[PDB]
Amino acid sequence: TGKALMVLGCPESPVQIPLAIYTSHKLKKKGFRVTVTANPAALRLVQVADPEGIYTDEMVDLESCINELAEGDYEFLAGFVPNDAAAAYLVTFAGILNTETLAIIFDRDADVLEELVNEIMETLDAEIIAARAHHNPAPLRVRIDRFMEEKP
Amino acid sequence: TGKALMVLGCPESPVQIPLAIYTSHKLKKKGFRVTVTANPAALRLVQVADPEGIYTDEMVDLESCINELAEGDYEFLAGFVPNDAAAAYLVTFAGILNTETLAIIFDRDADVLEELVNEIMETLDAEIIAARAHHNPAPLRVRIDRFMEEKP
């Protein structure tokens, strides 16, 4: 019950936006109202992929969200992390929210994933899902389903 | 009252799946029953981006569709064309359906677009929407809205 914030990274990989929507839909089926925060193209991709706004509840540009966010605004935080820039934003958002946090890391290079995994472990108190994926969402979708079966 | 078939190419550009779903929703808004056909990765992206099956009606693998298709099964044909392989598939589907057809050509390189545009013109009797887009769907989205306010 409550509100959830979902942070997206720059969209390069085809699996991101689709998985962002899938994860949001999963959260909504648990009672959460979810807010998506991302750069301009990423938010646009979400808007056209879900033209009627059925899988999402609200959207806000990264900097604007950073400017208005305060502790207690959300009980759940989910961040997609395809790179350094995305990791740093999730860390920032996490420091402000101080709530249940989830990092979803992905890239096709195991080394890059390892670097991203290390970074999140050393900085945040957060559950991690990490998979080598670029075009096939399966690995991540299954692991997200699993996470969702238990953790709110 | 009719049916439309939507053909997708290999998913690389993040604008494809979202725009495919956007276009299908536009068609359903016009009364069409929309069938999406593409490769495994592509179909899986569509399914995770629209987990409730709200924006499309049916989905079938490329080869399976090619194996069951006959003239008259669809009143409209739309094909996304990011490359040569995708253009050849659209040509094949168009030869079988012999109906109102639409090619949505995209790539960031204007030269590549030119070759794809020429190819469709020399091989097909289809309306063409082309744009240099990779991650921002806007150019294509606006051009699709325009086509839709008057064609299918």
Q: Tell me if B92 sits within 8 A of B85, measured CB to CB.
A: no
Cross-strand bridge partners of residue B7: B37, B79
Q: Tell me if B69 sits within 8 A of B93, measured CB to CB.
A: yes
Nearest residue to A103 via CA among A115, A114, A117: A117
**Among A residues 120-139, those touching chain B with beta carbons less than 8 Å apart:** 135-138
Q: Specify burial of residue B72 (Cβ count, 10 A radius: 0-12, 13-18, 19+).
A: exposed
Nearest residue to B35 via CA among B10, B62, B71, B67: B62
> How far is Cα of residue A86 from the mean position of the Cα atoms in its chain?
9
- All structural domains of chain A, each given as residue ranges with its CATH number in brackets, are 1-152 (3.40.50.10160)
Cross-strand bridge partners of residue A126: none
Contact list in A for residue B21 (CB cut-off 8 A) is 48-51
Task: Among B19, B45, B136, select the one facing A14 at the smallest CB separation.
Answer: B45
Q: Tell me if A93 sits within 8 A of A69, measured CB to CB.
A: yes
CB contact under 8 A, A48 and B21: yes
Give the whole-angstrom CA distance, residue A26 versus residue A4. 11
Amino acid at B113: L
Q: B14: which 2 tokens?
A: 């993040």
Give the whole-angstrom CA distance, residue A88 versus residue A27. 23
**Among B residues 20-49, those touching chain A with beta carbons less than 8 Å apart:** 21-22, 25, 40-41, 44-46, 48-49
Q: A49: which 2 tokens?
A: 């992929």
Contacts of A101 (CB under 8 A, 6+ apart): A77, A78, A79, A90, A94, A124, A125, A126, A127
For this entry, resolution in Å reads 2.2
Nearest residue to A14 via CA among B79, B90, B43, B71: B43
Task: Among B44, B49, B135, select the one facing A49 at the smallest CB separation.
Answer: B49
Q: What is the separation, in whole angstroms, between the first and last Cα of chain A?
A: 9
Q: Order of strands, edge to edge, in the sheet holding A100-106?
A: A58-61, A32-38, A2-7, A76-81, A100-106, A127-131
Give the whole-angstrom CA distance, residue B21 versus residue B27. 10
List % helix, strand, coil for chain B (3-state, nearest 5): 45, 20, 30
Largest CA distance in chain A: 39
Helices (H), A5-137: 16-28, 40-49, 62-68, 84-97, 110-123
